[PDB]
Design a protein around this nucleic acid. Structure first.
Ligand SMILES: [Mg+2]
Ligand SMILES: [Mg+2]
Ligand SMILES: [Mg+2]
Ligand SMILES: [Mg+2]
Ligand SMILES: [Mg+2]
Ligand SMILES: [Mg+2]
Ligand SMILES: [Mg+2]
Ligand SMILES: [Mg+2]
Ligand SMILES: [Mg+2]
Ligand SMILES: [Mg+2]
Ligand SMILES: [Mg+2]
Ligand SMILES: [Mg+2]
Ligand SMILES: [Mg+2]
Ligand SMILES: [Mg+2]
Ligand SMILES: [Mg+2]
Ligand SMILES: [Mg+2]
Ligand SMILES: [Mg+2]
Ligand SMILES: [Mg+2]
Ligand SMILES: [Mg+2]
Ligand SMILES: [Mg+2]
Ligand SMILES: [Mg+2]
Ligand SMILES: [Mg+2]
Ligand SMILES: [Mg+2]
Lengths: 149, 77
RNA sequence: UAAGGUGAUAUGAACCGUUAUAACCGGCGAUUUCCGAAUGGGGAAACCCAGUGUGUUUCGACACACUAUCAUUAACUGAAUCCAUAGGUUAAUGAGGCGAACCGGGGGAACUGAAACAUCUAAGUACCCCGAGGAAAAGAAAUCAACCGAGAUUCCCCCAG
RNA sequence: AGGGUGACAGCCCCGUACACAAAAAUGCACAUGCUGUGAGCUCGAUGAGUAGGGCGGGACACGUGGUAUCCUGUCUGAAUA
RNA sequence: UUUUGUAUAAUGGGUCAGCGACUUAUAUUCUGUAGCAAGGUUAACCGAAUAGGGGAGCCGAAGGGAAACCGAGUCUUAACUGGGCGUUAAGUUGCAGGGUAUAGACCCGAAACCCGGUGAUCUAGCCAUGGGCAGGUUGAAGGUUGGGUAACACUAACUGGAGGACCGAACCGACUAAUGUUGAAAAAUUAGCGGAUGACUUGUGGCUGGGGGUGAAAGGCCAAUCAAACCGGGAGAUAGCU
RNA sequence: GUUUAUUAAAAACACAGCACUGUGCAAACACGAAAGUGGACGUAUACGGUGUGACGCCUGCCCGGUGCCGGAAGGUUAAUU
RNA sequence: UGAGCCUUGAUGGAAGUGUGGACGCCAGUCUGCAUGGCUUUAAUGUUUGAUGUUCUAACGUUGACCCGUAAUCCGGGUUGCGGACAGUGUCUGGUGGGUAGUUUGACUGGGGCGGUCU
RNA sequence: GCUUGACUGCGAGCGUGACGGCGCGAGCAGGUGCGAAAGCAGGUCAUAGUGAUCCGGUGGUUCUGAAUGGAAGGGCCAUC
């Protein structure tokens, strides 16, 4: 008796997984109680796409936010002059918001929750390599042109 | 009436055939234990006079495929 | 079909007919009390008791008709429990019981023989049970054959005591 | 042929061979109408708690015997051209 | 008839008349007879039905060996011998008969065994509901009064009415004798006899069914039947016996 | 008191009493393939089985054999694997 | 707790001064815890047998309610108790005059006893 | 003293039994032993010391072996 699991089931659960168990455990508990279902192909050899409709489908044809670094890296100069003053310094600081904000192409919109900067960009002005770290391994790179007003 | 009910396995007769080969009608009878099944689809807890092995059938064909028949021949349930 | 008839022990009486339905023969119909599967309930068989109706009626009520059980279906109802089932009512159909043998199936002896008796025999006989037909059953190879081939089943004769 | 007739009848009677006859009712054949069924052609598919197996019985002429094959009460249980 | 042997006082028969017992089917072997002959003969079936057709097949002309095999030979054995069984045999198919086989197997006959039904109108238990017991006797427990006690015990009269209690009809039963014994009667009659308010007795209806019931237990009763009822069937059981 | 209806009424059976033993209730046990039923609408001061057979005085010694009760450590041991 | 398996052990980043466990030809030494210049065999997982617990969810209930239903049967439902036990089917050892079918020789100066049987 | 004739295959012909059997046996072939040799030896001076059949067990065998080759099984010989 295999039957595909449907929940936790102590020493054997996966909200969907086949496992050889005593028919006494099934048709008496692991079943008639909502916890499993016989492996009659129609629920596996035919209902296996459910397990292949994500990591193998909604993880490959999920074309949408995968081309981050590619979609964003050729912007129209993200000039973000964080002001300046007092012997050539800065009035404005660099943060997570302003960065992933001014980095908007054609009136587009970017969440500030996608930044690639270890610490806080101290007040300077020089080349600011502000990479657009969005997805885990799928991040991007942008820039900022801090100066004055 | 001591009938498998699901596979119509009635009690057949035979000989004891003790040592020395001595005839003596004995008759064998099915297992049966009248089980409590959960049709689920029908949302009912139907019970049948199912017998061993004949129970393996339900777990092989279908509690509904079985009830499909049975009710087909015009049996209770 | 017909000159005769009204069955018999049965005469007699009282009648019917001698051309074309007198009688009689055959086809199809009408009537067909009560008991009996007996079926409205009951019951010591041929009897007792009831409900609802119909039409007629002096309209009291009359008799008469329908009302068993189960099965399938339909419709309407409808518990524990929302639903839903279970259960209930109605209607339409079908069954029921008899039967001689043959037939299929379920169950299944012993005397007897073995010159005793357990294996074995009698015998899958007798018998009991269920089911069906004019027949039943069986039947178009997971059959045989033997390297050639045959070609469903059934029955007869051989093979062979 | 046969039966009857007051003793044994071809020619007395009833029959007998032969030849005819049905309002209607039906058995069986064909033939057709109504209903139901569904032909034929292409591409498919081609019978799992089964076949085998262990235990106990049973059926095969065959008394488990070296014993094939068949049915199965009981426990198992495959290939799938 | 049966016997060594029967007039036998051993069996059977009152007599008469009618009936009453070696059959039939298939098979196998002889004998007789007919046909044909190293050949004889068909079965079922067909059928222009006792024909004719049909030779599937059976028997015989070859035997020996356990067989492979060989063959008028062959086995045995290493074997040459020898010895065993064969080879200088006519068979076959009808018909009638003698015998055997399987059948009921000459005929009549058990005590029994098995299967399915019918029986608790008799009887044995039990269940439900009704009925019966003339008369006479005994006199328990309890109570009341007197006495008695510290109070109880206790005691005496009276009251009271118990009991598988007593005597005795109905009623139930059955110890004795006679008579009956082809009875009045398939268990009685007569004279005595036992119980007679009780484990009593009886009417009506009901429930136990056969290897089963019921039984204050005799194997007793279960319809004049009982160490396994009656009816029908297996069934013409079997019968080395008469 | 009961018994061999139809040869035995008794020293036989029965009995109140005694003793052993089983039974915790869905009791033991018994009828029944089963359902179910009696036991009992009772529940150990109750029910079943067996033997003895009022009452009085009593009921000794043997557990080797058989049965029954308890133990089961070890030896032997079925199906099965 | 037995047995499998093989996973990690002894077999076959530096000293030196406490402490367990290993048994030994020993007078051995083996190996795990401070401060300090492949077999013979055992823990981990695992598999599987052996009992012993606990659980519920089959299974039992001749507990208590509800409904079918103005029912004591029965069925469904709720709850309690018990619980993989009990109980049953197949197989299997024991027991088994409770029942059943039979056997239990002949000669013999009748039978039996005794004796005999080649 | 020396040896294994208590050999193998056969057997003219007889005796004795209802039968199943049982007994006696010269001589023949192969091979042995003892003897110089003729020759004797197929168990014991003879007559008791025994069990049919079935069902099997063990060895041997190109006898058979169910489509064929094997095999199981069967036969045959020896034997329990
Ligand atoms: Mg009526
Ligand atoms: Mg009626
Ligand atoms: Mg006999
Ligand atoms: Mg071919
Ligand atoms: Mg004499
Ligand atoms: Mg005389
Ligand atoms: Mg005469
Ligand atoms: Mg008295
Ligand atoms: Mg008198
Ligand atoms: Mg008196
Ligand atoms: Mg009466
Ligand atoms: Mg009588
Ligand atoms: Mg007979
Ligand atoms: Mg007779
Ligand atoms: Mg008396
Ligand atoms: Mg008397
Ligand atoms: Mg006594
Ligand atoms: Mg005494
Ligand atoms: Mg004593
Ligand atoms: Mg006996
Ligand atoms: Mg007998
Ligand atoms: Mg004698
Ligand atoms: Mg001598």
């Amino acid at each position: 008796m295999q039957v595909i699991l449907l929940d936790k089931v102590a020493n054997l659960g996966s909200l969907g997984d086949q496992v050889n168990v005593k028919a006494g455990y099934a048709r008496n508990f692991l079943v008639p109680q909502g916890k499993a279902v016989p492996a009659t192909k129609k629920n596996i050899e035919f209902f296996e796409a459910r397990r292949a409709e994500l990591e193998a489908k909604l993880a490959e044809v999920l074309a949408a936010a995968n081309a981050r670094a590619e979609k964003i890296n050729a912007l129209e100069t993200v000039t973000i002059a964080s002001k300046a003053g007092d012997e050539g310094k800065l009035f404005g600081s660099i943060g997570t918001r302003d960065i992933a904000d001014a980095v908007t192409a054609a009136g587009v919109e970017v969440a500030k929750s996608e930044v690639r900067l270890p610490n806080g960009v101290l007040r300077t002005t020089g080349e600011h390599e502000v990479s657009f770290q969005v997805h885990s391994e799928v991040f991007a790179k942008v820039i900022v042109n801090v100066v004055a007003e | 009436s001591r009938v498998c009910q699901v596979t119509g396995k009635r009690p057949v007769t035979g000989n004891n055939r003790s040592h020395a080969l001595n005839a003596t009608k004995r008759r064998f009878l099915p297992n049966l234990h009248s089980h409590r099944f959960w049709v689920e689809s029908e949302k009912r807890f139907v019970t049948l006079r199912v017998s061993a092995k004949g129970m393996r059938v339900i777990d092989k064909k279908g509690i509904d495929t079985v009830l499909a028949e049975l009710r087909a021949r015009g049996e209770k349930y």
